[PDB]
Design an enzyme around this catalytic site. Structure first.
Site, PDB file in Angstrom:
ATOM      1  N   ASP A   1       0.825  -1.214   0.000  1.00 26.70           N
ATOM      2  CA  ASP A   1       0.000   0.000   0.000  1.00 26.70           C
ATOM      3  C   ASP A   1       0.859   1.264   0.000  1.00 26.70           C
ATOM      4  O   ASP A   1       0.607   2.194   0.762  1.00 26.70           O
ATOM      5  CB  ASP A   1      -0.932   0.005   1.224  1.00 26.70           C
TER       6      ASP A   1
ATOM      7  N   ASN B   1       0.561   7.555   2.541  1.00 26.69           N
ATOM      8  CA  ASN B   1       1.076   6.557   3.477  1.00 26.69           C
ATOM      9  C   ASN B   1       2.558   6.717   3.783  1.00 26.69           C
ATOM     10  O   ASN B   1       3.203   5.782   4.264  1.00 26.69           O
ATOM     11  CB  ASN B   1       0.815   5.148   2.937  1.00 26.69           C
TER      12      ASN B   1
ATOM     13  N   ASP C   1       2.472   3.187   7.195  1.00 29.37           N
ATOM     14  CA  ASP C   1       1.305   2.347   6.920  1.00 29.37           C
ATOM     15  C   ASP C   1       1.696   0.920   6.520  1.00 29.37           C
ATOM     16  O   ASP C   1       1.226   0.391   5.508  1.00 29.37           O
ATOM     17  CB  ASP C   1       0.439   2.974   5.819  1.00 29.37           C
TER      18      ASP C   1
END
Ligand code: KRW
Length: 289
Positions: A149, A154, A167
């Protein structure tokens, strides 16, 4: 209430490496500094008082789900690199899921930072942030860790403007629900507009699909936080990529940097550059500034 006796003993040992006693943690539950699907992030103080970020997992009530999440994320304690978010510890207590204690990132997430109009980051600034991310990913890739991700939302920025890839592991969550869609083969919420073509087709993630995501992140940086493919519905992202179509060159992206983006999005995963190669290429581009 989460019992350690009910948890895998191997996981318990791993967790006990980084446990923080409740009396050593002060949490301000009236000060939300982030919001995820598993729980919110709060201003905390760790004690020598240290400002920290406290990530709740209270939305995860099932012991088995908490167990799986801890198992997948605890390896985070083994990582150490200036461009990778570190874990301060885990607070186990009388009631509620464990609290994940993270270093406070004074400048928040990278996407909001570059979208901020008063900041007005220069091309040099933005390429510099991109280089930092590449170095953090080079480290994670060397540890055989697949992020899954990677995106500007993030990555975090600390008080010295050092970018931390974030993240992942115990800090993993969906912090901006707008960019996750269930319109994919798994039926679960996924960041489909950051995913490599083969991940959309086969549901598999690798370091090379992280490289694809990094290409999208570079595009985010050079557009100062524009959303990718605003005109492509989540229903259409796979066929869009199958047709060979890609994100267009940002106005202030140097030609050589856009070439790097395009290499990140080669349909054959093995044809895309390693993060080690990306650090070399982007470092050279940055130095011309
Ligand atoms: O539109 C979404 C904005 N947003 C992204 C995040 C985010 C993205 N990646 C993350 N990795 N760990 N953490 C938890 C965390 C960790 C440290 C923080 N420091 C200051 C303020 C908030 C903080 C949040 C993360 N939070 C929070 N808000």
């Amino acid at each position: 209430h989460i019992d350690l006796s009910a948890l895998n003993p191997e996981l318990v040992q791993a967790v006990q490496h980084v446990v923080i006693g409740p009396s050593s943690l002060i949490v301000h539950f009236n000060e939300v500094i982030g919001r995820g699907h598993f729980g919110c992030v709060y201003h905390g103080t760790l004690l020598k008082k240290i400002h920290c970020a406290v990530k709740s997992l209270n939305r995860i009530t099932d012991i088995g789900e908490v167990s799986q999440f801890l198992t997948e994320g605890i390896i985070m304690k083994d990582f150490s690199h200036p461009n990778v978010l570190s874990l301060l510890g885990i607070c186990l207590r009388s009631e509620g899921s464990p609290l994940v204690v993270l270093p406070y990132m004074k400048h928040g997430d990278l996407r909001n930072f570059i979208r901020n109009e008063t900041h007005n980051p220069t091309v040099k600034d933005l390429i510099g942030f991109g280089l930092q991310v590449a170095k953090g990913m080079k480290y994670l890739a060397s540890k055989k860790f697949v992020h899954r991700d990677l995106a500007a939302r993030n990555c975090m920025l600390d008080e010295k403007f050092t970018v931390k890839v974030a993240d992942f592991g115990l800090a993993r969550d969906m912090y901006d629900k707008e960019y996750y869609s269930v319109h994919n083969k798994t039926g679960a919420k996924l960041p489909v507009k950051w995913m490599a073509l083969e991940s959309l087709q086969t549901q598999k993630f690798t370091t090379k699909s992280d490289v694809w995501s990094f290409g999208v992140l570079l595009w985010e940086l050079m557009t100062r936080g524009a959303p990718p493919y605003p005109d492509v519905n989540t229903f259409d992202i796979t066929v869009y990529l199958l047709q060979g179509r890609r994100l267009l060159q940002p106005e202030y992206c140097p030609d050589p940097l856009y070439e790097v983006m395009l290499k990140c999005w080669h349909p054959k995963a093995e044809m895309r550059p390693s993060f080690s190669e990306l650090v070399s290429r982007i470092s050279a581009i940055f130095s011309t500034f």
